[PDB]
Design a protein around this ligand. Structure first.
Ligand SMILES: Nc1nnc(-c2ccc(O)cc2)s1
Ligand SMILES: [Cl-]
Ligand SMILES: [Cl-]
Length: 182
């Protein structure tokens, strides 16, 4: 009762509608993207600097690193919201790669509605240091967006894009989109 048709609007980009939201996937370096929010997949200490967390903390800068450590030593956080530093975004949301991916994406969507944001870009959360299986991660990300739409929670959020470091993981996301398409 939600899914549109899978097509390719731009070279290496695949998209489909999920209710009112445009869902897109592509391979590349997430630190070159522009969006209201960029998501970082990190450790429970919010100081991982390996794979996607290395590229995001390096390009964001030491002021963002300081924000992460300052919030980390204040309370036990499921995720942390910082400034964008030198990334092309308004905020970074740092989620824990080992946590339930559906719950992490649900939290990102709810925080973006609170700020009246329209665009989100995320990595294949948990497929790096956390070593979660790509097929399970794709199913969880798309399930979170479906639930958000079903509950009537999508109002400001219009575009959710997954930018994926390995082309082989992109192929798993595209197969999941084709499974669901109307
Ligand atoms: N096995 C891997 N999963 N993630 C990787 C990654 C992601 C973003 C980067 O900027 C660099 C490496 S390698
Ligand atoms: Cl990860
Ligand atoms: Cl990725």
């Amino acid at each position: 009762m939600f899914y549109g048709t899978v097509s390719s609007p731009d070279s290496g980009v695949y998209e489909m509608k999920i209710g009112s939201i445009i869902f897109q996937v592509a391979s590349g370096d997430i630190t070159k993207e522009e969006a209201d929010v960029i998501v970082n997949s990190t450790s429970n200490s919010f100081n991982l600097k390996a794979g996607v967390s290395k590229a995001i903390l390096e390009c964001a800068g030491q002021n963002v690193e300081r924000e992460c450590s300052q919030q980390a030593q204040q309370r036990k956080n499921d995720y942390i919201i910082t400034g964008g530093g030198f990334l092309r975004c308004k905020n970074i949301i740092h989620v824990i790669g080992g946590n339930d991916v559906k719950s992490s994406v649900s939290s990102v969507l709810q925080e973006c509605e609170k700020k009246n944001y329209s665009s989100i870009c995320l990595p294949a959360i948990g497929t790096g240091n956390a070593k979660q299986h790509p097929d399970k991660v794709a199913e969880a990300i798309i399930d979170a967006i479906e639930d958000f739409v079903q509950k009537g929670s999508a109002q400001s959020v219009k575009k959710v894009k997954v930018v994926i470091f390995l082309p082989q993981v992109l192929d798993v996301f595209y197969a999941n989109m084709k499974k669901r398409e109307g």
